[PDB]
Design a protein around this ligand. Structure first.
Ligand SMILES: [As]
Ligand SMILES: [As]
Ligand SMILES: [As]
Ligand SMILES: [Mg+2]
Ligand SMILES: [Zn+2]
Length: 351
């Protein structure tokens, strides 16, 4: 209901224009946030669920859905530069687009589609704007609870599911016990997979799958067993999570400005607490351009190249944009002279 969003007819008309790109890679989620009183995750998720008739299929009332989504979205930190609800909204919408790629047509069940989009929506909830290592190094209660392993990722999941218990928030109330068990299994799998420390293993497994790749007479992929389906889904969400460099430059630049701002803020916290500054977190040493080029060359491109292979020729335009964006950043490198976590990777592979 538009009233729950507090949007007037004028901005509702603006949103109607923006949402024409709901099923497109070119959707501008920044504009959606601007016309929805900064509730891009709830707005885009509502639009997605309506578009896919998910509310109908799973007997989720608009009331329960919006209440839960607004609750979830409010648990993202609006003062965190990158890992906020705008990023979650972007990953959710990007996942929604990837799910409809021709090569995957009719491959996934409605429960798997629900699980993937839900996973994308909650994958960074209650993110503090600092890395797992920062939490571990400060002897954070969170790190102690999760034994220093995928600390934030485990937390995002715990929060995402815990919020279903708040008043009028159980969007899975009408799923069968079996469906809830299966969806929960898949969501946990996908969110845990967003831990950048698992990237290399994910890509390797994905490549191994592309080898045994099977298609139909029309070209559609064939995934008849659960293990292969969840493997594609976990990589799909991971790709959506790493899709910023594949969007139009106007968007990509904003995403980059944001992640750097977030890294710099962690750097400020480290300096404030007498800690050594983490890689990429010192604005007076960080090479933004070099870092993006290196990150694309060693992490993003390899991943998307593999995904494109799996769904060829579906993701060709994405690869072209990624290439153009990479070369733009390489050109922007101030005319100069001659680990296993995002921050460490960006510093290591720095071009
Ligand atoms: As909306
Ligand atoms: As991320
Ligand atoms: As990252
Ligand atoms: Mg994350
Ligand atoms: Zn993310």
């Amino acid at each position: 209901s538009i009233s729950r969003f507090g949007v007037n007819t004028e901005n509702e008309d603006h949103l109607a224009k923006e949402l024409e790109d709901l099923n497109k890679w070119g959707l501008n989620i920044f504009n959606v946030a601007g016309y929805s009183h900064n509730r891009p995750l709830t707005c885009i998720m509502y639009a997605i669920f309506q578009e896919r008739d998910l509310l109908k299929t799973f007997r989720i009332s608009s009331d329960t859905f919006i209440t839960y989504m607004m609750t979830l979205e409010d648990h993202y930190h609006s003062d965190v530069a990158y890992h906020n609800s705008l990023h979650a909204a972007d990953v959710a919408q990007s996942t929604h687009v990837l799910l409809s790629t021709p090569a995957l047509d009719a491959v996934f069940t409605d429960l798997e589609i629900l699980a993937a989009i839900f996973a994308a929506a909650i994958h960074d909830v209650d993110h503090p704007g600092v890395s797992n290592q920062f939490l571990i190094n400060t002897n954070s209660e969170l790190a102690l609870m999760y034994n220093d392993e995928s600390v934030l990722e485990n937390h995002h999941l715990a929060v995402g599911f815990k919020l279903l218990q708040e008043e009028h928030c159980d969007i899975f109330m009408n799923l069968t016990k079996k469906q809830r068990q299966t969806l929960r299994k898949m969501v946990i799998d996908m969110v845990l997979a967003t831990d950048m420390s698992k990237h290399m293993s994910l890509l390797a497994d994905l490549k191994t799958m592309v080898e045994t790749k099977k298609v139909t007479s029309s070209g559609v992929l064939l995934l008849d067993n659960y293990t292969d389906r969840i493997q594609v889904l976990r990589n799909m969400v991971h790709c959506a999570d790493l899709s910023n460099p594949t969007k139009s430059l106007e968007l990509y630049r904003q995403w980059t400005d944001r992640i750097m701002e977030e890294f710099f803020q962690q750097g400020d916290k480290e300096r404030e607490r007498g800690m050594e500054i983490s890689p990429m977190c010192d604005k007076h040493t960080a090479s933004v351009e070099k870092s993006q080029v290196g990150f694309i060359d060693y992490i993003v491109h390899p991943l998307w190249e593999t995904w494109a292979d799996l769904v060829q020729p579906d993701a060709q335009d994405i690869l072209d944009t990624l290439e153009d964006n990479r070369n733009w950043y390489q050109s922007m490198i101030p005319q100069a002279p001659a680990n296993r976590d995002c921050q460490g990777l960006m510093e290591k592979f720095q071009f």
